[PDB]
Amino acid sequence: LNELQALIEAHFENRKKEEEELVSLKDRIERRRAERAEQQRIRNEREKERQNGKRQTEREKKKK
Amino acid sequence: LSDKLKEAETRAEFAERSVTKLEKSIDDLEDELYAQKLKYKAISEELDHALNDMTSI
């Protein structure tokens, strides 16, 4: 039925397409987070770089 | 100042460790939020896709 089928297809397309938009972009955000954290780690590496007997003798005797 | 430094260093180290703990917890939240979205909207939105078919017939 036009009303129900139209609204539920609007549902499918609009909302879940949008949801995958969210998935993608939030994944982008998290990737940014992790990469910049690792970059800080490498920075810290570089900066801390900037912040910088008798038994032997007798053994030798016997063994040789 | 040596103590203020050790204390500030403790604070710097604290903050480096706190940051480290939070570097871990931010990544855990980045991964948990990721995983929850990745599994939650991906599964429940999928379940609504399945609704498109589940409720057919």
Binding site: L4, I8 | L51, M54, T55, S56, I57
Partner: peptide
């Protein structure tokens, strides 16, 4: 699953009407 609460009602009406007729058809003798 409102789509089928609604489909259910439609089929319920279709069968209820067919059933009303099954019952009448037998009741009519």
């Amino acid at each position: 699953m409102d789509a089928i609460k609604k489909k259910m009602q439609m089929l319920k009406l279709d069968k209820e009407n067919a059933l009303d007729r099954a019952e009448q058809a037998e009741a009519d003798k």
